[PDB]
Amino acid sequence: IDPPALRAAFAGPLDPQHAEVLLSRYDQHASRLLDALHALYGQRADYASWLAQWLGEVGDIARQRPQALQTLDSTRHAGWFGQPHMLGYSAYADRFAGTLQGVAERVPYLQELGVRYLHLLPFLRARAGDNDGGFAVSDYGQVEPSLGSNDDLVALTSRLREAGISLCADFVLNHTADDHAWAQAARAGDARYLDYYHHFADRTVPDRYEATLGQVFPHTAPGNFTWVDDTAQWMWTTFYPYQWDLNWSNPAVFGDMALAMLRLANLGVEAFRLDSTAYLWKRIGTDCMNQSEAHTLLVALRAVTDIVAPAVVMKAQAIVPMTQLPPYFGSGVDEGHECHLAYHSTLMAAGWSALALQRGDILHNVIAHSPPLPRHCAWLSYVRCHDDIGWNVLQHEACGNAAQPPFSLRDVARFYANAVPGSYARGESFQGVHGTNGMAAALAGIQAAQEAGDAAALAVAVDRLVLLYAIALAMPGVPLIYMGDELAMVNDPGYRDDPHRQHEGRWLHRPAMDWQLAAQRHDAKSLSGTVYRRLRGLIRQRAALGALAADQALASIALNDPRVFALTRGDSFIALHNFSDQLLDVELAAIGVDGWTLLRGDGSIVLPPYGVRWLQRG
Numbered sequence: 055i056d057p058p059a060l061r062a063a064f065a066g067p068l069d070p071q072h073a074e075v076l077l078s079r080y081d082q083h084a085s086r087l088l089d090a091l092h093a094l095y096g097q098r099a100d101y102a103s104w105l106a107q108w109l110g111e112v113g114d115i116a117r118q119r120p121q122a123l124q125t126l127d128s129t130r131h132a133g134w135f136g137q138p139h140m141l142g143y144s145a146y147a148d149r150f151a152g153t154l155q156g157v158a159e160r161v162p163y164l165q166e167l168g169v170r171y172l173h174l175l176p177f178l179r180a181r182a183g184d185n186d187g188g189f190a191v192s193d194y195g196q197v198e199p200s201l202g203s204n205d206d207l208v209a210l211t212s213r214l215r216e217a218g219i220s221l222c223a224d225f226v227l228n229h230t231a232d233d234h235a236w237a238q239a240a241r242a243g244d245a246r247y248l249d250y251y252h253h254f255a256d257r258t259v260p261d262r263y264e265a266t267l268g269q270v271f272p273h274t275a276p277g278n279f280t281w282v283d284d285t286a287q288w289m290w291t292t293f294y295p296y297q298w299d300l301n302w303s304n305p306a307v308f309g310d311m312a313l314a315m316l317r318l319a320n321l322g323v324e325a326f327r328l329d330s331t332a333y334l335w336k337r338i339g340t341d342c343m344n345q346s347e348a349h350t351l352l353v354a355l356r357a358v359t360d361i362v363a364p365a366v367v368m369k370a371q372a373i374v375p376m377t378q379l380p381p382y383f384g385s386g387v388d389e390g391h392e393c394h395l396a397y398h399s400t401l402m403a404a405g406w407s408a409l410a411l412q413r414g415d416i417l418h419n420v421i422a423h424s425p426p427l428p429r430h431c432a433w434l435s436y437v438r439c440h441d442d443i444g445w446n447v448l449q450h451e452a453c454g455n456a457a458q459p460p461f462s463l464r465d466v467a468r469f470y471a472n473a474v475p476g477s478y479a480r481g482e483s484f485q486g487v488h489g490t491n492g493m494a495a496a497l498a499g500i501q502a503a504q505e506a507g508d509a510a511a512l513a514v515a516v517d518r519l520v521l522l523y524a525i526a527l528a529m530p531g532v533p534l535i536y537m538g539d540e541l542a543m544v545n546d547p548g549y550r551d552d553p554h555r556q557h558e559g560r561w562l563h564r565p566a567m568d569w570q571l572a573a574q575r576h577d578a579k580s581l582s583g584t585v586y587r588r589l590r591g592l593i594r595q596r597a598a599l600g601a602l603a604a605d606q607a608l609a610s611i612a613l614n615d616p617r618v619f620a621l622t623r624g625d626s627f628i629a630l631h632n633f634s635d636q637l638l639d640v641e642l643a644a645i646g647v648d649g650w651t652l653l654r655g656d657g658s659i660v661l662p663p664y665g666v667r668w669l670q671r672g
């Protein structure tokens with residue numbers, strides 16, 4: 055290619071007043087972008103032609119970036135998302151406050167909680183009919199009418215931004231709704247857009263891929279491939295049948311998606327949850343996951359953002375085994391130049407496992423096996439979310455090692471399914487071992503306690519819930535609270551009586567916000583008020599501990615008491631966790647300390663059942 059030629063295409067649509075800063079960033083990241091793109095599409099006859107054109111469109115989008123956001127681009131500090139005041143909150147805009155304007159009216163609630171990061175679930179145009187809770191996107195550039203307009207989105211981000219809250223939005227970049235403008239163009243016979251997806255005239259290729267492909271909905275939707283009349287072909291569909299996998303091997307797809315992303319950024323979104331990002335690249339003979347190219351694709355999108363909107367962050371999802379997570383942060387030449395965040399799905403699943411089995415040693419294993427985060431990278435740590443808990447990511451760990459004996463994922467799954475006598479949990483099986491649905495409060499024993507009017511059990515359960523969250527709060531990066539958990543909200547059986555949802559078990563833990571329950575957060579004596587106060591405590595404390603910043607180290611101290619989990623941050627902070635229902639103490643000699651206690655140390659630390667203690671070493 056011809057660098058000066060490509061740079062000129064990019065510049066040009068730029069405003070003379072901002073041309074200097076942008077061209078400066080373009081000069082330091084462009085090469086990475088170009089190398090990534092070349093490895094992906096360099097062999098194509100129309101490469102150089104597409105690049106130049108595309109680059110010209112990237113520059114025009116760069117010019118349209120509102121001044122306030124450009125200023126943010128220049129003032130924001132790298133690794134900003136990893137500061138100790140960062141607290142995350144995830145929820146559906148509709149379940150939470152009806153519309154985007156309604157959500158804006160609720161910002162005072164988020165501010166009171168201490169939220170600085172707000173993830174709104176899919177809110178862009180979704181397929182008519184069932185749209186997988188918004189995950190079948192029909193237009194990446196338009197808010198879903200029932201939720202509002204693009205104007206409300208902009209007004210919302212401006213409101214959140216002044217409250218120090220960064221909007222995280224889903225970029226469902228692996229697949230589109232089958233009614234997206236592209237699928238409709240494809241369905242109409244437009245070969246150009248038909249090529250934006252994976253399509254096959256026969257069952258030939260599908261049969262092959264299926265030989266080594268796993269399944270996301272083995273029961274509900276063995277839909278991994280679908281025959282579509284309109285296109286007269288088999289369409290790759292990893293998820294529901296109406297969600298078509300995009301063909302990222304086509305530069306057109308890459309170019310249009312990078313643009314879509316930059317337009318969202320321009321509307322004020324600061325963080326992009328790259329949904330199903332492990333499935334991006336398809337290659338025969340492979341499970342088509344975590345492929346090397348998927349990573350190159352991410353490096354490219356990352357370069358595009360470093361140049362056009364550096365204040366923006368990319369968060370990888372990927373529900374995969376531990377060894378597959380860290381590479382989303384970039385590898386070798388590209389380490390530190392891929393995703394800034396990754397959901398620590400292993401830590402989260404390991405937490406519920408540790409709780410059911412009353413084994414702190416399982417958490418020690420996860421942390422010990424958690425490699426140190428690269429420069430300006432961090433974890434998205436969490437307790438629950440809109441999805442089912444995927445246990446199978448803990449297979450390797452379940453096998454056990456020299457320090458930790460084996461554990462049964464099957465036993466854990468049954469415990470939370472309440473298919474085993476004595477269980478305080480009330481969840482359900484989703485799709486052998488696979489997944490479990492249910493609210494945190496429902497899994498922690500709170501729902502069962504309330505169900506039986508047993509105050510003793512309720513308190514113990516509150517402890518279990520707080521325990522799990524204390525861990526996420528002690529982690530380097532963004533601890534994401536799932537809507538309602540701060541009030542101990544329980545399951546929502548309502549979907550069962552709904553022909554539109556009864557088929558999707560995950561609705562069990564996707565309730566509408568209980569604002570009357572929210573008002574109780576004040577009555578310190580109420581359950582909600584109690585849970586809310588305990589969490590609020592840990593949040594205010596973590597905000598005051600520079601030792602918890604993402605740049606500080608994360609490690610765990612090996613103990614011979616299987617029930618305890620000792621987590622350390624930097625060299626001055628240690629959090630002790632008792633995952634058993636038994637009172638016990640941790641000897642200071644077992645952690646090499648002798649000091650302070652957070653929101654006084656001389657002798658072992660006594661930890662009640664399911665208790666947590668934060669201490670400042672020394």
Ligand SMILES: OC[C@H]1O[C@@](CO)(O[C@H]2O[C@H](CO)[C@@H](O)[C@H](O)[C@H]2O)[C@@H](O)[C@@H]1O
Nearest residue numbers: 186189270293329330371372373441442
């Ligand atoms: O069983 C859940 C299955 O789907 C995943 C993909 O990583 O979830 C994300 O993407 C789905 C399809 O777009 C959404 O339905 C889901 O809500 C979203 O979190 C994983 O949770 C898991 O592999």
